[PDB]
């Protein structure tokens, strides 16, 4: 794994697949982990479907064995098929969802639209999928159906694909670096809302997410104004004056001797 251009840490698709392989049966593993692994593998599926669709199918089989059928896994696999340019497989996955009873989801319909656009199917098919979704109720349109479909198509065109020429997904350049260029980078309005936080603070944040889940459903100007950090003690601390505490790093003394060191690791994305 490495920090990309945005100082965000991302795992290589191969690393994610190997983590999945080694943690298939662990107690903490979940359908969310399976779908995240499929997500990580998606770029490789697009680059070479003939060698990575087998891995995606293995993940799908493991998911069926452990957790059975789920909207998350079906959506992930149909998105992988769409990236691999397998429209018949996307349709087969949708049909399997309908047969098993998993109500088709807005994500599934968007996956169908993406597959149609990537494979080059006429826009009539994408319009039909969007209309089916809106009738089912998975998708809700505030504008007219034609305008909503145009907006979705424009968003998908902006995204593009991995082999495409123009598109956000069509940009493989990344500022790879073991460490972020600015460790005090902010994600919010104050140094309290720093992008990088200690492991214990992150664990507390995860517990907050899983426990106080209701608060995420509401938002009010009272909270928005309360968040303004104009009375948040923008002062200094002894660690600010001296330096970060000298915490020893994680030394891999037992690591095996490095082989293929002369060989560079090509970008996976």
């Amino acid at each position: 794994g490495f920090y990309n251009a945005g100082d965000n840490f991302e795992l290589t698709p191969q690393a994610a697949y190997r983590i999945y392989k080694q943690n298939c049966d662990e107690t903490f593993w979940t359908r969310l982990h399976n779908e995240k692994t499929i997500i990580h593998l998606l770029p490789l599926v697009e680059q070479d479907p003939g060698t990575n669709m087998v891995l995606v199918d293995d993940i799908f089989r493991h998911h069926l064995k452990r957790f059975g059928a789920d909207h998350y896994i079906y959506n992930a696999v149909m998105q992988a098929a769409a990236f691999a340019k397998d429209f018949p497989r996307c349709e087969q996955l949708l049909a399997e969802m309908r047969g098993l009873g998993l109500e088709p989801n807005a994500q599934s319909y968007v996956n169908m639209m993406l597959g149609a656009r990537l494979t080059g199917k006429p826009r009539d098919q994408a319009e039909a999928f969007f209309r089916e979704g809106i009738k089912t109720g998975a998708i809700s349109a505030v504008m007219r159906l034609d305008t909503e479909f145009q907006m979705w198509m424009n968003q998908l065109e902006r995204l593009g694909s991995f082999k495409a020429k123009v598109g956000y997904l069509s940009v493989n350049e990344e500022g790879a670096s073991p460490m972020p260029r600015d460790m005090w980078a902010l994600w919010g309005w104050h140094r309290t809302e720093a992008k990088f936080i200690s492991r214990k603070q992150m664990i507390s944040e995860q517990v907050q997410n899983r426990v106080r889940s209701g608060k995420e459903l509401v938002g009010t100007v009272y909270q928005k104004a309360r968040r303004q950090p104009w009375a948040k003690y923008n002062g200094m601390f002894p660690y600010d004056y001296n330096g970060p505490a000298r915490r020893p790093a994680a030394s891999f003394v037992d690591a095996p001797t490095p082989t293929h060191n002369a060989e560079v690791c090509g970008t996976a994305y």
Partner: protein, 53 residues
């Protein structure tokens, strides 16, 4: 009877509302921003008083 004894619980004119306290009054954007400002100023005041003490 017991019904006669309890006949005064109900409100003859209006409905039988279970509670109506200060917490039930709604507040618009202006009132909400005022309350947020007051809370932030109170936090700053507590911090300053603690520093003084």
């Amino acid at each position: 009877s017991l019904e006669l004894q309890g006949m005064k619980a109900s409100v003859d004119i209006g409905p039988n509302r279970f509670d109506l306290n200060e917490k039930d009054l709604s507040l618009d954007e202006e009132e909400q921003v005022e309350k947020a400002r007051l809370d932030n100023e109170l936090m700053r005041w507590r911090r300053l008083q603690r520093a003084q003490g």
